[PDB]
Amino acid sequence: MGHRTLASTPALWASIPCPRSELRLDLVLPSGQSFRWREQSPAHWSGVLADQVWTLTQTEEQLHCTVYRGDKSQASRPTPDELEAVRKYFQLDVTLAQLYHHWGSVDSHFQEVAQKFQGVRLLRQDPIECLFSFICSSCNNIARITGMVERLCQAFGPRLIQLDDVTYHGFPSLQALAGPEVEAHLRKLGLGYRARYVSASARAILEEQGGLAWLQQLRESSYEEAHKALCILPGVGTKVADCICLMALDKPQAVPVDVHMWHIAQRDYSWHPTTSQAKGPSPQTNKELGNFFRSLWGPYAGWAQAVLFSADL
DNA sequence: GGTAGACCTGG
DNA sequence: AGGTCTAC
Ligand SMILES: [Ca+2]
Ligand SMILES: [Ca+2]
Ligand SMILES: [Ca+2]
Ligand SMILES: [Ca+2]
C-alpha cells in the first residue's frame, strides 16, 4: 500500500493526547529543525524517528501516529513503548501553555504575535544528525540544506524501507562519514566546502575526541562547556554550536544569533549594543544579543526564539 | 582582536 | 538562508 493515512488504514494508527495548542506539526516539522520530514499526503508527515519510519497527523485533540514495520513484521498499531519515542522526540513533558504564559507575561510583543502562532516547540534530535545537518547549514537556504541532507543519507545511510517511490534511510554513522574518499563523494552531491567539514568533523570525533560518547555526554555538560567543546570541531562556529546545543543537547537557553535575530532585536525590541562599541554583528555583540534574550525570556529563551522565527519565515 | 578577504553554488 | 576558517 505504501504511505498510510488516517482515513486509509485506521486500524494501524494509535493516538497521543496532544492539543494543537501544544504542537503544530506544520510549524515545527518543516521549519528548519529537522530536514528529514516530508508531507507525502496533505496533513500527514512521514520521517525517520528512533531508527524506524513514522507517519504523523493531528486532529484538534490528538496526535495520530503510525510506524512502518517492514516485511519482517505484520502490520500493528504502535506499541506504548514505540509511542513514548514520539513523546520523547517532541518533548511533550514541556508544556507550551505554561511557557507561552511566562513569555507573554514579561513581554508584551510576544503576547501579540504568539496568539497567532501556537504549538511551536523544539524537537529533541540525535546529536549526530543535528551536528552534520547544521554543518551543512552554513551559507545555505533550508531547501538546499534539505536536499544536501537527503542526498547525504541516501549515499551513506542504511536503507530502512521503501514506501511508494521513497526509500527511507537512517542518518549515517561517524564511521560512514569518516570513511575514505567521503569528501570527494559529498562534493559530487553538491555540498561544496561543507564536504570537507563533514569528513573532518566525523574523523575529529572518532580519531581525536574519543568517539560518539564524547558528543552524547555533552548533554550532561553545561551550555558553556558544551559550546566550547563543539567549537573545536571543523565547520562548527558560534551559530552552529548554539543550534546543536538547543536542538540536540538539551540547552533551552541557547540562542543562536544570526542577522534574522538582529532584524527582530531592532524592529521589535529596539535594541542597541552597550558593551561593544561596534554597532553591527560581531563575536562581542552576538554574545550580548544571546544574553539579552536569555535575560528577557529566561531559561527557555531558545524556544521563545523559535516562536518568533516561525512567525516570520 | 574585531574586521576582509577565500570557500562552494544555484542564481 | 548567508557561516566558518584563516589572516594581521
Ligand atoms: Ca540513532
Ligand atoms: Ca509495529
Ligand atoms: Ca532519506
Ligand atoms: Ca570549529
Q: Is A34 exposed, middle or buried (0-12, 13-18, 19+ CB in 10 A)?
A: buried
The CA distance from A190 to A198, in Å, is: 13
Instruction: Please count the residues of chain A.
Output: 313
* CA to C1' distance (Å), from A160 to B8: 31
Separation between the CA of A281 and the C1’ of B11 (whole angstroms):
26
Q: Across the strands, what pairs with A166?
A: A163
DSSP codes, chain A: --S--TTT-GGG-EEEE--TTT--HHHHSSSSS-S--EEEETTEEEEEETTEEEEEEE-SSEEEEEE---SSSPP-PPPHHHHHHHHHHHTTTS-HHHHHHHHHHS-HHHHHHHTTS---------HHHHHHHHHTTTT--HHHHHHHHHHHHHHHSPEEEEETTEEEEPPPPHHHHTSTTHHHHHHHTT-TTHHHHHHHHHHIIIIII-SHHHHHTTTTS-HHHHHHHHTTSTT--HHHHHHHHHHTS--TT-----HHHHHHHHHTT----SSSS--S--HHHHHHHHHHHHHHH-TTHHHHHHHHHHHH-
Pick the CATH number of A94-114+253-313 from 1.10.10.10, 1.10.1740.10, 2.160.10.10, 1.10.1670.10: 1.10.1670.10
Cell digits of residue A151: 542526498
**Residue A217, burial from CB neighbour count under 10 angstroms (0-12, 13-18, 19+):** middle
Note whether A58 and A20 are within 8 A (CB).
Answer: yes
Residue A166: closest CA among A252, A55, A301, A303 = A55
**Candidate CATH numbers 3.40.50.1220, 3.30.310.40, 1.10.1060.10, 1.10.287.3510; the one for domain A10-93:** 3.30.310.40
Domain spans in chain A, listed from the N-terminal domain onward: 10-93, 94-114+253-313, 127-247
3-state secondary structure A202-243: HHHHHHHHCCHHHHHCCCCCCHHHHHHHHCCCCCCCHHHHHH
State the catalytic residue, choosing from A72, A116, A228, A239.
A239
What's the gap in Å between A256 CA and the centre of ligand 3? Answer: 27
A127-247 shares the fold of A94-114+253-313? no
**Resolution at which this structure was determined, Å:** 2.8
**A233 beta carbon < 7 A from strand C?**
yes
For residue A34, list its beta bridge partners.
none
Comparing C-alpha atoms, which of A44, A87, A46 is closest to residue A67? Answer: A46
Bridge-based pairing of strands A62-67 and A159-163 is unpaired
Cα(A181)–Cα(A159) distance, integer angstroms: 21
CA gap A170, A247 in Å, rounded:
18
Q: State whether the beta carbon of A31 lies below 7 angstroms from any atom of strand C.
A: no
Is-contact A250 A124, C-beta < 8 A? yes
Distance, CA of A9 to CA of A288 (rounded, Å):
52
Place of cell 522526540: A89
Residue A195's nearest nucleotide, by CA–C1', is: B8
Q: Out of 3.40.228.10, 1.10.1760.20, 1.10.3720.10, 1.10.340.30, which CATH number does the structure's domain A127-247 have?
A: 1.10.340.30
Residue A158 · residue A44 · CB < 8 Å: no
Encoded amino acid at A231, one letter: C
